Assembly symmetry: D4
Homo-oligomer: 215 residues x 8
């Protein structure tokens, strides 16, 4: 089978949006989009789920040492070889107010991740090739009813509206494929951040189409 | 299904032993012991493969920044919740000559990993409990025909022979389960380090029994 | 007896406000609010005083390496187990001009401390549970007659007026108790920063009621 | 009342020794030696308990970031002013095999702590003087039935036999008070490391005499 | 022959401008300005090419650890002794938006490099003198059709326009030779950043005159 | 004799202002103000000159690792015991544009140096007392004809007009002596930054009066 | 022409051995082995000289920050693309007594450099492939008359005798070419470390044959 | 007057030996050897005293951050220009048992200091040349009655006896002046470490001769 690694944040993990913000649980394996992707691709594909809630592209979060995507991705790639394609959907967490990042800064973080994929051939001690990479801008954020989410994401809705543009430009320069998740879904979870069951279905179906076309 | 994360090194990844040392490829999904484990346990269980070749317990390798297990594990656990059990088989790489580690130093690295599993409840924003842990000593190393492996593993065999004892002592102190892989297989790969198809099968069958006893 | 850890800054230590700014002394053990709290609760409770003047939530002070609350709290918690409750009143120092922090930044520092309490079960080698936590916003700052305090707290009053709102939002999200010190006292010390004897009395009496409600 | 800070490790915290090593609980407040000390001294004195299990003099423990005594002590001293005396009993953990420390190295660690006490006058913004210091060597370790404790303390029984000598030499050089806990008790806990109820009583009574002599 | 080291970025390496941004190749050795310089100077001179694409004066690039000029230059000078002149043309990369540098900041980076050249006498174990230095401001950037170049260089056109003035002031203060590449060429490459064949020729001819005037 | 340490920057070293900016020489020992101070005090005082050109209060200069005053002062104090008084005149370099410091930031740097003086009793192995400290604001800067000095000091003329205010407030709070050099001289050097012969004489005479009054 | 980068230490730079140890000069361009190599190969090849005296494989020298080969090589490769072959001769400096390195440690450093070459495709923004690599063990060291060289190289002659073996093993494992300089020359310089004119000729001739076999 | 910087440790500061080890005071200005040197040389020379008790050549002391000679020297040299000669007597503290240094390691630290002096021309913004250097081995240590000194200097008598040999070899290689203090005095202080009045006189007279011979 061809092997597809989905690297991302809570949107990849499958965070169930709740009115009280947190804590929550994971969408069922056949409901979260990575599962819908697996189902739509079929049994000659294997999907590997590497979504970590709150993960950023390449910035340390002072509240939690686990969340720097670029710190983890090289080790993850070498763990999962052989791989055919890595889907990277990140950037939503980088738009939190405390990071004070512009859309460019976020695209630069994404560029680091893209380069990690492109330079991954061989892993540790193998003959395996580098996978391809698909850069995915997350859908724009929506208004958030929970006061804490409103606070931590101040300015974030605005910055997420620019990610499709800056990620498309980056992908074009780096000669790697791009897909805008916002082109097929809006962020419809009750919290303004996460995905509904239908959001997950629609993105999984859309990404299966992208994956088939790329391989 | 109950979820089992197998955190380890090349022995968990499925490195195919070769006479010329490296490079190599991965054992087929149903051949490597993690796949044997999955097949033996059947559909009431799910296995997650997190084996990274050359990984250590908790020591940076000056040749490769990807290999410190303890740097990666917390992020891995939070990625994969919900989990029921983490099987950790590490320590072989720590016995390389260049690390100058004693069996105690290696057991201390394992202790860090055990604590990371025991303190993992909730992950990022969830209601999930911590998984159980199973500490696994790898089998003793064997004579290595390739001169580079002989060099990098000088003194290593003797240290691997002590890991069942030090890990059992650690596990008893921390009140967590222990299993010695060396109690069911010898290291029979042609390189003196990695596993044959039969080694993989025997370990997968043995670990399935261990999993059933714990979950 | 139930053990209550009071983790804070000079307002917890008991700094006596003086017209010449500094130096000063500590309020007497029966006058500072932690002592009032102890007296009001009686012998079924033991109050542990951990107030360090000038302490911040989680930011290094360039003038003094002792003042990062988050650097100290985990060691403090493991020292003081068994614990039933940790009361945290911090954020006033974070509002000093030189830190250039917003109310959100300060609430994020508070979030780090909350998580350190919530994840403290066991300490070093024990069977003890984590304590509960009570997040306390300090009262707003008041006019300051001393020229140096005027300088270092420029913009601070306005930030302290926002802390009840941002800490309440945080506590709600994290599902932990919140209390606003500003709901029972104003900052009445002559320096515009610290507490009078009556401020200490009133806060100690109010907090005893909070403690009894939680334990 | 005169204020006495007891800075130490699990022997100050009051670890209850057990046959199975860990986990355990704390001796009751009236049983641990810091409580005995307080009772023996009476109302003219106040005892502050700052014992952290596994704490070293001044060395980072790779397994736990909380354990470097010298990292914490300056903040602790400024927290607890006004102080009349600091009793420091540390060095047992420094004798663990993995630290590879000699008795001299351990005494040098103690020297750092002594200097932190001697240089602590004023704290943050106060008129208080520096407290006196009392350097205390812990009793020699004893045979340990638990295999993990045997492993981690290999060579440590021997090193602990030398601490009275090297600490006495240090304290003489630094012109500060010294007391050997081994002059009054042997390590009689079932694990070979920690104190019995009677050890706690005997040491508390002995230290009360030392405090009265100094204050 | 007198030896001339040309230390720079892609403008010194000889990056061929392309409409799709990247990837590209190097201008031929007789076409890039360092080769024109060598040809124009003739046999009494020797040119050493040390241009690294994307290199900055003295600032780490978060996307690529190879790019800090000041990290490399001292090792490079000691490698190439004996030297008569070092031509330094850098600053263009420093004007990328993500570095948030002012013309002054960039001139201060150039100052570090100048001092590295001035203090280079002897290298490792030699009797050789320091070379002279020639500070060169790059020409102003121009409009960039590629959306990714436009993004990463936002604000850069404006900052590059100031480099001749700030570098001239620096060089005057430091009492070292200065030349403005913008005095003889405009940035005519199709991407708005790199040099055409004619730009290379004109700059090489001009720099040959500067070299003869200094050596 | 009483021992007076003069800790400062180029204005303490005795930089001779020159129209061409740099390089320069030092004023003669009887002309620089530290020499005038010595003469005025007489031979029952010993003046120790510790002026380092370009030194800041407590901020690293990216162009030169020698220039952080606070990195050097504790070692300097311990070198020169016994000492009666330390005169600190710093802050001019902190006003350089690249540091992006406010007058408050610079006063906070000064506070670190004051504390280092006040906590210096005993040095290494001695019985000697801490010296007193005299905080001195440098005179305001003047117009600078040299384009490099104009560049690096942009915004600094205005900041230096504020140092007397912020340093007087700091000194008042810390209960240490203050003197404004601007109260007796203007910056009359041809470069707008450094002192003329008369500026040196007038400041030395004034500081001798201050020293006598303080001891 | 095909481009050959010679990455090395003083043996590549062309250090002229002298009886007084240091300082010295460089062998003439037609005498040092890199120039003999160029002459032997002729105009279809281009030799790039990157030898830095005292350079180590991958270890910082406490006396000189310029000397870590692995710190410099990635930047050097990207500078000099396009490249066809990198010849690496290093390890002599790693045998200095102060580094306390074994032959394995030195071969591990070499491994880092080999990996840097193998992973160098593309450089910064190019279409160029990775060059091939040739690992070269230096000849064994000889007796040294200068007392300082005797001191700093104590144990080094014995370690250098082992480098051909360990480098051969490493090269075999990594599936890259290997050549032992010691197979064609002995270290005949008067200082017991550096090369004579004839040593340079013989190695240049031998390495030209090696190059012709690879390209 | 020519300016002579005496850079050293307690032997340069003028530590008065005492039977109780520490604390002590400084020898009077005309009794410590730097003052003897000044009196002997007379008014055409100016001696600058830069002796810091416990200073090492270039190693951090874990007990005291002030003691790394190499961290301080470059800033000191630039402070004290113009300079004619730097006399460096260091290495005694590096022989303390806890540093685990060999004589070679200490000579390498001295080499760093020598290079700092040799490369000091110009300082910050000046026209001044580098001073000359004189490398001075301290005399051999002697038997020590104080138990703390016996402990911390274990192995030091042997190592200090080697310093004249290794420093002479170093100075010869580096082509700089060397003088052995042990050629004119023995360490006659009652503590076995520091100098008597006569030791000071004898060394000061000897060094005056060395200074005149070099200048």
């Amino acid at each position: 089978a061809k092997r597809i690694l989905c690297f991302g944040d809570s949107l990849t993990w499958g965070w169930v949006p709740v009115e009280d913000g947190a804590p929550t649980e994971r969408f069922a394996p056949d409901v979260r989009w990575t599962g819908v992707l697996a189902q739509q691709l079929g049994a000659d594909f294997e999907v590997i789920e590497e979504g970590l809630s709150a993960r950023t592209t390449n910035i340390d979060d002072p509240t939690d040492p686990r969340l720097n995507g670029a710190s983890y991705l090289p080790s993850c790639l070498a763990t999962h070889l052989p791989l055919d394609l890595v889907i990277i959907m990140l950037g939503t967490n980088d738009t939190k107010a405390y990071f004070r990042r512009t859309p460019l800064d976020i695209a630069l973080g994404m560029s680091v991740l893209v380069t990690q994929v492109l330079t991954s051939a061989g892993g540790v001690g193998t003959t395996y090739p580098a996978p391809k990479v698909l850069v995915v801008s997350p859908p724009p954020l929506a208004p958030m009813p929970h006061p804490w989410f409103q606070l931590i994401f101040e300015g974030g809705e605005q910055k997420t509206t620019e990610l499709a543009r800056v990620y498309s430009a980056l992908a074009s320069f780096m000669k790697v494929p791009f897909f805008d998740a916002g082109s097929v879904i809006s962020t419809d979870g009750v919290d303004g951040i996460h995905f509904t069951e239908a959001n997950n279905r629609d993105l999984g179906v859309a990404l299966a189409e992208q994956v088939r076309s790329l391989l």
